Design a protein around this ligand. Structure first.
Ligand SMILES: *[C@@H]1O[C@H](CO)[C@@H](O)[C@H](O)[C@H]1NC(C)=O
Lengths: 34, 48
């Protein structure tokens, strides 16, 4: 089985695409549309 | 329907038209123009 991705059911008008213990840190910010 | 044929005069043969249209909703750094070369040198006073 091992089936997944039940997150959404629509992906319209896409304006951007891209494809390609332990500590995993992230910093998120949103400035001038970036 | 346009019925095109090769034995037509100019003004009735099929032309292909493409149009470009820009708009800057607000983007500050989107797709811009490109650039190119200009031989690199070293050990010279230059304007770079
Ligand atoms: C976004 O999608 C809707 C349909 O869901 C469509 O009417 C609209 O034209 C689309 N917008 C763009 C900018 O393509």
């Amino acid at each position: 089985m091992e089936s997944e991705f039940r997150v959404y059911s629509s992906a319209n008008n896409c304006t951007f695409e891209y494809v390609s213990k332990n500590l995993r840190e992230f910093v998120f910010k949103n400035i001038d549309g970036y | 329907s346009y019925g095109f044929r090769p034995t037509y005069g100019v003004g009735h043969q099929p032309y292909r038209v493409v149009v470009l249209s820009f708009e800057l909703l607000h983007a500050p750094a989107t797709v811009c123009g490109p650039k190119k070369s200009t031989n690199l040198v070293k050990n010279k006073c230059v304007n770079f």
